[PDB]
From a paper:
Clamp loaders place circular sliding clamp proteins onto DNA so that clamp-binding partner proteins can synthesize, scan, and repair the genome. Here, we report the discovery of a second DNA binding site in the yeast clamp loader replication factor C (RFC) that aids in binding to nicked or gapped DNA. This DNA binding site is on the external surface and is only accessible in the open conformation of RFC. Here, we describe a series of structures that reveal that RFC has a second binding site for DNA on the external surface of RFC. This external DNA binding site is composite, consisting of three domains of Rfc1: the (BRCA1 C-Terminus) BRCT, AAA+, and collar domains.
To reveal how RFC binds to nicked DNA, we determined the cryo-EM structure of RFC:PCNA:ATPγS bound to nicked DNA (with a 5′ phosphate on the non-primer strand) to 3.7 Å overall resolution. Unlike the 5-gap and 6-gap structures that exhibit a 6-nucleotide ssDNA span that links the two duplexes, we observe an ssDNA stretch of 5 nucleotides in the nicked DNA structure. The ssDNA is more taut in the nicked DNA structure, reflecting the mechanical stress that the DNA has undergone to fit within both binding sites. We observe DNA melting at both separation pins to create the ssDNA gap. We observe clear density for three melted nucleotides at the internal separation pin, with the nucleotides extruded through a cryptic channel that only appears upon RFC opening. We also observe one melted nucleotide at the external separation pin. Therefore, to account for the 5 nucleotides of ssDNA stretching between the two sites, there must be one additional melted base pair that we cannot directly observe. Despite the ambiguity about exactly how much DNA each site can melt, we unambiguously show that the external DNA binding site can also unwind DNA to allow RFC to bind nicked DNA. The melted region of the nonprimer strand is in a channel formed between the BRCT domain, the AAA+ module, and the collar. We observe no ATP hydrolysis in any of the active sites of the nicked DNA structure, establishing that ATP hydrolysis is not necessary for melting at either the internal or external separation pins.
Residue numbers in the entry:
A (entry chain E): 4 to 120, 133 to 353
B (entry chain D): 16 to 353
C (entry chain A): 518 to 775
D (entry chain F): 1 to 255
E (entry chain B): 4 to 322
F (entry chain C): 8 to 335
DNA sequence: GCAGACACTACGAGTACAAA
């Protein structure tokens, strides 16, 4: 399991030694630390690196986490509840759970910690891409005013959502995704400790290639193979793809095979099924676009038109509340292209 | 003494915040007017608008300190950011009440040492975030009460401010901080913190900053901390700064251009996937692509005209919060078709 | 009754000569039901050359403004179920549908700008054209089947409920799992199924303890288990599977957990 | 500096309560002769002119003319923050800012210090026009307040008519009408209950009910109120204090 | 000076039903009800300044004779017209006893009735019917859609129309004769054209022209009252060449001080109200002006964005 | 203070109707109205800083005298735009008589374009009913916000943007009151950059007096105006446009970058200068104008949202180059 | 002095946002 083996210190980090050394360099003198913005591909392990850096700054009780609930009131009398994951030396806030009221929790609770005050308490904004631009602009001055009491470490996957002033205010620490070799080494250690019999070692490299740099995905896929192959991985073990991936693949097959509005009916039905089951629309757009590009039949003109329409409707989705209104438009434009 | 040590151990962005108006490095066309208005007592209504990290807040925090003095500033200054709600109510209740109050009594010490002008300055940081209704409410609040209060609005984009509000305020544009104007200040900070650099390190830091001094200070602090952790005693090199600034290596950029030269969609897609398996930000990729293509003299004028518009469209989309992979692939494919 | 009372004061004979003016002056202007707005909006006669003079564009904006909360959704739901009759020479149904969908996306942008913190309600006439009038004009014609109600509301409520459930499970698993809300559903839940439901499918009633163990490894409850098993889609749908495990295993599982 | 002491701290409370409802912002100008206040309502229909004299204070010292601008609502709270058996002190520095109100009782040693931030009110017209009104009447405050409060229930407009030794208050509304007629009578056994009326030319003009109900709130200061009426002139409702007066200049409605 | 004269709008307000010029059929019906009696509940709808308040007041006065003081109840938007006024004031007024001529009844005039709250409108439904034997309600409103259908059912719907130029000319000629004002036919025609059927605006502009300049001429009237903004907007939109339209926008609109929001909104309204252009082209130009309107409302209001909007419109017209 | 410690925009506020320039038609017509006593309900609509509030305040001063702040109901509609104000303050003020002197009543509603629709729908009968004793003045920047009903009860006066003569006369008065001198070319630059707003010229004049080493012995040249405001010089605009138009891409980039860096010029100001100059041009084909205008509008809108300055500058260069490439 | 008794003010939930 991914939980069963997670580095708990900087010295236990095993991939991208450059980032490890940079984190130890920052932790050498922690009394002078600017705010951090970790970014990179999802599944790289940036959160673990944040925790290891935090452990190097403070004591090793940084992992003694406790969940607390802090009720708040919005502009209206509606009541919102946020669960804060907290530790004696730091706290975590994830605005993405709320909607457009994130500013409130950004503007009050953070300031409250500043009013409370190893002279600084680190606040980890796990989801800062989902932070509204208004919420970021509210955090703008909380970032500078209370810099002697509060020092933010903000975890991100894409810097583009975050406005320019915030990126200016914090040191940017890139997290490169582990290459297939280190992922294979980690998988080898995992199978060694978990006692998974391996027919050969090419299976680990195949898993690494099937995850596209994600270590969470690679480890979870390894476990999923171990539960379908009786804890003994063979050469011909089929790679387990998550359900949404097969649904998007079948949607791609339907789109390429049937370029009709009647087929658009079922495409909208499938998109509704995916959306209603806790799946973001931008990820659906990305996966569908890349799957459509991967189909061999289309010529280069069709692929270029598909990527153009995908870019346009990705912008449309980024500026639109109703997700299906843009995904169906993208699908219709692609079907018209073919 | 305590505050001196506190600022001595803080991020270099906050440690070297300009205490006085002279320490402003390159925004002379505004600080000169403020310095001469120190002698008089006719401070106009002011709108500080410029790129982030230029020095609007530092200038407006030094001006009040010089005009009123340390102790009296707290009484004669009201500061309202975007972290505080700034609707119609907070314009008609908090701001109006502060304006209506008579000017605080200057003490003897403040009068002998500091000019003590007969008004109070309301500093509205991030006035762009305010809704049009609140600005319309402030329109005449600034006017009728100009005798005892002065209004300063700081905004990143002047377009957000409504037309009459900008008309009333004296518009001060804080110029971008490139290498030429801020090299002296950066060298000053480096010398005070004993940072040892190669000839072009500070200038290169300023160019990567692209008109932002705060990013330059953060990069210099990161490089200095890394060098001190290394313990070699050598100087920070330009390549180290580029590594710590999220700059794509020249080899990878060259490989990107070679892949665009060979117009194969599949090869470009594969290399783009491998490239995005690293945290190379798409904006920093588009900037270097623009530099390489436009600067190079081996490209035709028509090709440059097309590629400039393509890069502009890609930047416009990428600044809206869309998916970096899709936009980067679209841009590279369209350049390949060129 | 009141019409006759008012009109009979001056004109003593109500006949076929003046009935047209009486109707034109006394007609009831009642806000149509959203189904009627959808029917008239997706009508070929409305956007034809002759029909446009009878029903001007302002009247179509008024039809939108009758109900400004549902017509955008009704048109989006029933703009692809009509046989078009205003197709330009050289255009198929799919091209008009794609243009209409692009217009609905632009209207969604306009609606978000209208219905956000800026509250730019002055764009309400514009949202009339982009969301309702333009796509309907693009795919105007005869109604193929029936006019269905907006499915967006129900699926949106379902998505809100599933998001709430995912929040509960994620915050229950937070103390062990280093993820966000979306990552859990995307990656962990497919793996969590293999360690929760599959042992009940294969090894039998003796899986409970093991299942309980992994349950107790992430502070899951029975409601949590039922919620996790309801998040899968497509091939891995578990609704039929949970029916096929024998009732003895279920009763033993609940009894052991309790 | 200003150091003005009221023996009866409840006196200033009652005067301030007299016009707290009518106006919110006031400029108390303290000179050597005493505190003088003038203010105008938001509707700009009623004017309030307080005139406190030196005799009112135990100890009044005003070195130089001073203007203290304040909000009536907060100052009313601050006055209510004091006991009845107290002495009051208004204190102001050389530069007018943050007036200090000081309640003392030395029978049981107790100090209560409060602050009120001054506010820059530009309007300082400070002018009234003494006129030869058409009619001058004087009647007990309780009777006039009773009459106004009972005729305010019928309509929002109350008409006052002054004729030869006759005072008429009329109120015509939607539920009906009402009219009370009184005559000026002089009572030797009890002088305080008498009614005086000196008329030069008969008057007929209307006021709003809300403003009359707010004016009669000053009946707690003096036991008798004077009313000066004239043809298209601000009606003068005066409550005479021991050292000065509180006068409401009301603007009648237009026919 | 201290005192001011009455505006000719209020001074020359029709005091008898015959003076009202336009909408002849409804006015004649109101005169017949005035003579006969038994006025039913009514809703008077139309555009501003075509004599809706004046008509109901002439009718009420003529019906109630000397009893206008007690039998007629004014309720205006300036007053509190919530459900409270229906419960307390309207109900008590309707329950009141009052002896009237044999045919006439007490009259409730609810001017600006379109702004009545939904609760008050619903509460009025039973007060309308229970006490109809004694009181008759009359509503006057610009928009009849705001009044609930249950209320609309119980009353006669009278819809007024915009006044034709001839009737405005007749009324203005009568006022001209009574007030001895010097005029020219061109000035009167310009006044009617600028009024656009709004008789109130016609009289106000006539009085203002007489006061400011002294002679009703085309030059003086056009000086005191601008040529309509929608007309120059329509001319700019329907220009043959881009440069001509740019010249109109620069000289007639931008240099004369009209704000960008005003130009964009008027362009949208002129486009949606245009008839010569085919519906598809009108819709696409509407889309372009919608994009421009979004840009203006986002703070970017300059001559460049409007010029780009016109360039897009001309591209759309030029295929 | 003595009205000398105030900003020049406020200290030079007109106090009499003879100190308001530019809107001579409106001033003369209103003066004649108030002299003959037939003053109708006024609606002054115009751009900011064109002198509507000053005009109405001076009108109140002339009609009522020095004590105009107690006998006129001046209400900032932005601060209070509710129907409660219409019911309570406005109607009570209109109905009653005056506490100070006999005469009619004036209600000055400033920024009534923010007034809510319910408030205006309530006021459309307060205006009509009490026309015997009160008159209403409505000040507006935008007339589209105001209800159509409130635009039929008020005589409309449009305030034109301030022309060269009136603005120049006001600068002459200011340089007379202070000890300052203005070069004719600097005055021309001030007028060009004013865009019809006296607030802009007053603010820039104060800033240019500030930037001088010492006032009353030095002059304010065009360099002072352009540097203090930060606006691009016409020479820089012409040089940038010439480099873009008739030379290779590399030196065009060099010229734009050097011009921007040396004087700190902003990109949007350069874009506005370039589009003005190119509008002054004569162009052979319409397609050039269409492409040029549409593109520059797109780059301007993108600049408003921020981004990469170099990319936007290159986009401007390419847009101009291609648009004039259509002219072959 | 001490307790209700209406009457005013503060709080909270629901609804509509345009154009002619
Ligand atoms: N002109 C300057 N001179 C010296 N240091 C500067 C200057 N501008 C910025 N800095 C440095 O950058 C820090 C941040 O400056 P700020 O004034 O907050 O930037 P900014 O204009 O407020 O940008 P925002 O708030 O995102 S719009 C200061 O504390 C200084 O360390
Ligand atoms: N048909 C008409 N004949 C004569 N005068 C008219 C006519 N219509 C309008 N007027 C003039 O315009 C003034 C206003 O009339 P009203 O009836 O009050 O306007 P309205 O039609 O009710 O529209 P409102 O008041 O905006 S809801 C009258 O006093 C007349 O001076
Ligand atoms: N015509 C003018 N003559 C002289 N000074 C003027 C003129 N117009 C504007 N000013 C100056 O500019 C200042 C602002 O004038 P205002 O009348 O307040 O602007 P405005 O016309 O009300 O526009 P707003 O407030 O944005 S709606 C005045 O105090 C004068 O100093
Ligand atoms: N050096 C490492 N050794 C072992 N596992 C790692 C390492 N780095 C990352 N991982 C694995 O990656 C998984 C996800 O990392 P996480 O920090 O959640 O990524 P992100 O925060 O980018 O979503 C973890 O379960 C962890 O086991
Ligand atoms: Mg700042
Ligand atoms: Mg009317
Ligand atoms: Mg103004």
């Amino acid at each position: 399991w991914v939980d069963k083996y997670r580095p708990k210190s900087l010295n236990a980090l095993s991939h991208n030694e450059e980032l490890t050394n940079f984190l130890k360099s920052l932790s050498d003198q922690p009394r002078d630390l600017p705010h951090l913005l970790l970014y990179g591909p999802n599944g790289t392990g940036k959160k673990t690196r944040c925790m290891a850096l935090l452990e190097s700054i403070f004591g090793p009780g940084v992992y003694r986490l406790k969940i607390d609930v802090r009720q708040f009131v919005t502009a209206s009398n509606r009541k919102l509840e946020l669960n804060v994951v907290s530790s004696p030396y730091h706290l975590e806030i994830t605005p993405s759970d709320m909607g457009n009221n994130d500013r409130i929790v950004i503007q009050e609770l953070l300031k409250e910690v500043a009013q409370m005050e190893h002279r600084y308490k680190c606040v980890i904004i796990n989801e800062a891409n989902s932070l509204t631009k208004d919420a970021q602009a509210a955090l703008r001055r909380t970032m500078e005013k209370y810099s002697k009491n509060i020092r933010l470490i903000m975890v991100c996957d894409s810097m583009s959502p975050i406005i320019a002033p915030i990126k200016s205010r914090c040191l940017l620490i890139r997290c490169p995704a582990p290459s297939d070799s280190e992922i294979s080494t980690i998988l080898s250690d995992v199978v060694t400790n978990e006692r998974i019999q391996l027919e050969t070692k090419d299976i680990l490299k195949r898993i690494a290639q099937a995850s596209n740099g994600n270590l969470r995905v690679s480890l979870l896929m390894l476990e999923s193979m171990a539960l379908n192959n009786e804890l003994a991985l063979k050469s011909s073990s089929p790679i387990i793809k998550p359900d949404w991936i097969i649904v998007i693949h079948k949607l791609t097959r339907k789109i390429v095979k049937e370029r009709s509005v009647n087929s658009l009916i079922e495409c909208r039905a499938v998109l509704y099924d995916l959306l209603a089951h806790c799946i973001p629309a931008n990820i659906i757009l990305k996966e569908l676009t890349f799957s459509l590009l991967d189909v061999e039949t289309l010529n280069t003109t069709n692929k270029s038109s598909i990527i153009e329409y995908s870019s346009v409707f990705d912008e449309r989705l980024s500026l639109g509340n109703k997700a299906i209104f843009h995904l169906e438009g993208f699908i219709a434009k692609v079907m018209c292209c073919l | 003494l305590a505050a001196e040590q506190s600022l001595a151990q803080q991020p270099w962005v906050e440690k070297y915040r300009p205490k006085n108006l002279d320490e402003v490095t390159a925004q002379d066309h505004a600080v000169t007017v403020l310095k001469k208005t120190l002698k008089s007592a006719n401070l106009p209504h002011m709108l500080f608008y410029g790129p982030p990290g230029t020095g609007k807040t530092s200038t407006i925090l030094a001006l009040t300190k010089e005009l009123y003095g340390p102790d009296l500033m707290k009484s004669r200054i009201l500061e309202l950011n975007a972290s505080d709600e700034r609707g119609i109510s907070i314009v008609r209740e908090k701001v109006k009440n502060f304006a209506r109050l008579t000017v605080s009594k200057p003490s003897k010490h403040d009068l002998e040492n500091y000019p003590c002008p007969p008004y109070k300055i309301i500093i509205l940081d991030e006035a762009d975030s305010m809704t049009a209704d609140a600005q319309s409410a402030l329109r005449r609040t600034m006017e009728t009460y100009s005798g005892v209060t002065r209004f300063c609005l700081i905004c990143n984009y002047v377009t957000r401010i409504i037309d009459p509000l900008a008309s009333r305020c004296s518009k001060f544009r804080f110029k971008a901080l490139d290498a030429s104007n801020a090299i002296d200040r950066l060298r000053f900070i480096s010398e005070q913190e004993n940072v040892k650099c190669d000839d072009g390190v500070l200038e290169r830091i300023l160019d990567i900053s692209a008109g932002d001094l705060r990013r330059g200070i953060t990069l210099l602090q990161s490089a200095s901390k890394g060098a001190q952790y290394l313990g070699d005693g050598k100087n920070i090199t330009s390549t180290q700064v580029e590594e710590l600034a999220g700059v794509v290596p020249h080899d990878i950029l060259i490989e990107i251009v070679e892949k665009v030269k060979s117009g194969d969609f599949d090869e470009i897609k594969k290399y783009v996937n491998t490239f995005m398996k690293s945290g190379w930000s798409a904006a920093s990729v588009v900037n270097q692509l623009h530099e390489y293509y436009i600067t190079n003299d081996n490209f035709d004028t028509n090709f440059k005209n097309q590629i400039s518009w393509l890069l502009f469209t890609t930047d416009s989309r990428l600044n809206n919060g869309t998916n970096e992979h899709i936009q980067l692939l679209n841009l590279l494919v369209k350049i390949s078709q060129l | 009754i009141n019409l006759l009372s008012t009109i009979s004061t001056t004109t003593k004979t109500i006949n076929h000569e003046n009935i047209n003016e009486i109707s034109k002056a006394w007609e009831k202007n009642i806000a149509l039901k959203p189904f009627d707005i959808a029917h008239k909006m997706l009508d070929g006669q409305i956007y034809s050359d002759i029909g446009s003079r009878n029903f001007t564009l302002n009247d179509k904006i008024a039809l939108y403004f009758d109900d400004f909360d549902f017509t955008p959704l009704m048109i989006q739901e029933n703009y692809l179920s009509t046989r078009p009759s205003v197709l330009k020479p050289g255009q198929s149904h799919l091209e008009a549908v794609a243009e209409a969908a692009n217009c609905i996306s632009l209207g969604d942008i306009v609606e978000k700008k209208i219905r956000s913190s800026e509250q730019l309600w002055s764009l309400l006439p514009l949202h009339a054209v982009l969301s309702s009038v333009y796509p309907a004009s693009k795919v105007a014609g005869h109604m193929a089947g029936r006019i269905n109600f907006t499915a967006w509301l129900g699926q949106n409520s379902k998505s809100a409920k599933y998001y709430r459930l995912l929040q509960e499970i994620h915050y229950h698993t937070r103390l062990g799992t280093s993820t966000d809300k979306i990552g859990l559903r995307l990656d962990y839940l497919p793996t969590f199924r293999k360690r929760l439901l599959d042992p009940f499918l294969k090894q039998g009633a003796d899986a409970i303890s093991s299942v309980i163990e992994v349950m107790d490894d992430y502070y899951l409850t029975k409601e949590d288990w039922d919620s996790i098993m309801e998040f899968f889609v497509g091939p891995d749908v578990t609704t039929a599977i949970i029916k096929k495990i024998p009732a003895t295993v279920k009763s033993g599982f609940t009894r052991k957990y309790n | 500096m200003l150091e003005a002491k009221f023996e009866e701290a409840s006196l200033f409370k009652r005067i301030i309560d007299g016009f707290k409802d009518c106006v919110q912002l006031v400029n108390f100008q303290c000179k050597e002769d005493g505190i003088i206040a003038q203010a105008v309502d938001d509707s700009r229909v009623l004017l309030v002119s307080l005139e406190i004299g030196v005799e009112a204070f135990q100890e009044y010292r005003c070195d130089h003319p001073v203007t203290l601008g304040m909000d009536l609502t907060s100052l009313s709270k601050i006055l209510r923050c004091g006991n009845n058996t107290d002495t009051l002190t208004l204190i102001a520095d050389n530069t007018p800012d943050s007036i200090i109100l000081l309640f003392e009782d030395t029978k049981k040693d107790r100090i209560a210090e409060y602050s009120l931030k001054l506010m820059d009110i530009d309007a300082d017209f400070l002018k009234i026009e003494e006129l030869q009104y058409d009619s001058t009447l004087s009647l007990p405050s309780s009777e006039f307040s009773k009459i106004v409060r009972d005729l305010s229930q019928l309509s929002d407009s109350i008409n006052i008519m002054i004729t030869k030794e006759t005072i008429k208050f009329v109120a015509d509304g939607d539920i009906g009408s009402g009219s009370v007629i009184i005559k000026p009578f002089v009572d030797m056994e009890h002088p305080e209950t008498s009614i005086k009326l000196e008329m030069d030319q008969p008057v007929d003009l209307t006021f709003g009910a809300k403003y009359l109900l707010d004016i009669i709130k000053g009946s707690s200061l003096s036991d008798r109120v004077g009313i000066r009426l004239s043809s298209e002139a601000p009606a003068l409702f005066q409550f005479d204090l021991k050292s000065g007066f509180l006068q409401f200049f009301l603007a009648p409605k237009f026919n | 000076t201290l005192s001011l004269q009455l505006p000719w709008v209020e001074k020359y307000r029709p005091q008898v039903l015959s003076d009202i010029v336009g909408n002849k059929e409804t006015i004649d019906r109101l005169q017949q009800i005035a003579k006969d009696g038994n006025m039913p509940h009514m809703i008077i709808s139309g555009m501003p300044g075509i004599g809706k308040t004046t008509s109901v007041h002439c009718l009420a006065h003529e019906l109630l004779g000397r009893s206008y003081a007690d039998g007629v109840l004014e309720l205006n938007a300036s007053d509190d017209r919530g459900i409270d006024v229906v419960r307390n004031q309207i109900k008590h007024f309707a329950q009141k006893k009052l002896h009237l001529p044999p045919g006439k009844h007490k009259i409730v005039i609810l001017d600006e009735a379109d702004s009545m709250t939904a609760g008050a409108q619903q509460a009025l439904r039973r007060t309308m019917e229970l006490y109809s034997n004694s009181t008759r309600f009359a509503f006057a409103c610009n928009q009849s859609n705001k009044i609930i259908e249950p209320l609309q059912s119980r009353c006669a719907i009278l819809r007024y129309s915009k006044l034709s130029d001839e009737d405005v000319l007749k009324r203005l000629l009568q006022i001209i004769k009574l007030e001895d004002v010097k005029y020219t036919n061109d000035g009167l025609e310009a006044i009617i054209f600028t009024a656009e059927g709004d008789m109130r605006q016609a009289i106000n502009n006539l009085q203002s022209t007489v006061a400011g300049h002294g002679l009703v001429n085309a030059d003086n009237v056009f000086k005191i009252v601008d040529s309509p903004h929608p007309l120059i907007v329509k001319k700019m939109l329907l220009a043959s060449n881009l440069e001509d339209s740019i010249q109109i926008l620069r000289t007639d609109l931008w240099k004369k001080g009209y704000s960008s929001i005003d130009i964009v909104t008027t362009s949208f309204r002129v486009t949606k109200n245009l008839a010569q252009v085919k519906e598809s082209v009108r819709l696409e130009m509407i889309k372009e002006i919608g994009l421009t309107h979004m840009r203006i409302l986002e703070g970017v209001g300059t001559y460049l964005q409007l010029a780009s909007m016109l360039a897009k419109i001309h591209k759309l017209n030029n295929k | 203070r003595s009205k000398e410690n105030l900003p020049w925009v406020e200290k030079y506020r007109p106090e009499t109707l003879d100190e308001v320039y530019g809107q001579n038609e409106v001033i003369t017509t209103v003066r004649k109205f108030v002299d003959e006593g037939k003053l109708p309900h006024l609606l002054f609509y115009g751009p900011p800083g064109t002198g509507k509030t000053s005009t109405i305040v001076a009108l109140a001063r002339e009609i009522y005298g020095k004590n105009y702040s107690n006998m006129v109901l001046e209400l900032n509609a932005s601060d209070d735009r509710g129907i409660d104000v219409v019911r309570n303050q406005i109607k009570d003020f209109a109905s009653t008589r005056q506490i100070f002197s006999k005469g009619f009543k004036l209600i000055i509603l400033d920024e009534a374009d923010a007034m809510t629709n319910a408030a205006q729908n309530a006021l459309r009968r307060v205006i009509e009913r009490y026309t015997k004793n009160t008159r209403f003045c409505v000040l507006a920047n935008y007339a589209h916000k105001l209800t159509p009903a409130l635009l039929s009860r008020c005589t409309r006066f449009r305030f034109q943007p301030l022309p060269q003569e009136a603005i120049e006369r006001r600068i002459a008065n200011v340089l007379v009151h202070e000890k300052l001198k203005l070069s004719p070319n600097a005055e021309k630059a001030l007028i060009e950059l004013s865009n019809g707003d006296m607030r802009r010229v007053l603010n820039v004049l104060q800033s240019c007096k500030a930037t001088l080493d010492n006032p009353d012995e030095d002059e304010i040249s065009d360099d002072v105006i352009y540097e203090c405001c930060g606006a691009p010089r016409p020479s820089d605009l012409k040089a940038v446009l010439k480099s873009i138009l008739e030379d290779d891409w590399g030196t065009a980039h060099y010229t734009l970058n050097k011009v921007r860096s040396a004087k700190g010029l902003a990109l949007i100001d350069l874009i506005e200068g370039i589009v003005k100059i190119l509008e002054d041009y004569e162009l052979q084909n319409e397609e050039t104008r269409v492409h040029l205008l549409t593109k520059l509008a797109d780059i301007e809108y993108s600049i408003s949202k921020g981004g990469n300055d170099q990319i936007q500058g290159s986009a401007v260069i390419g847009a101009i180059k291609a648009s004039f490439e259509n002219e072959t």
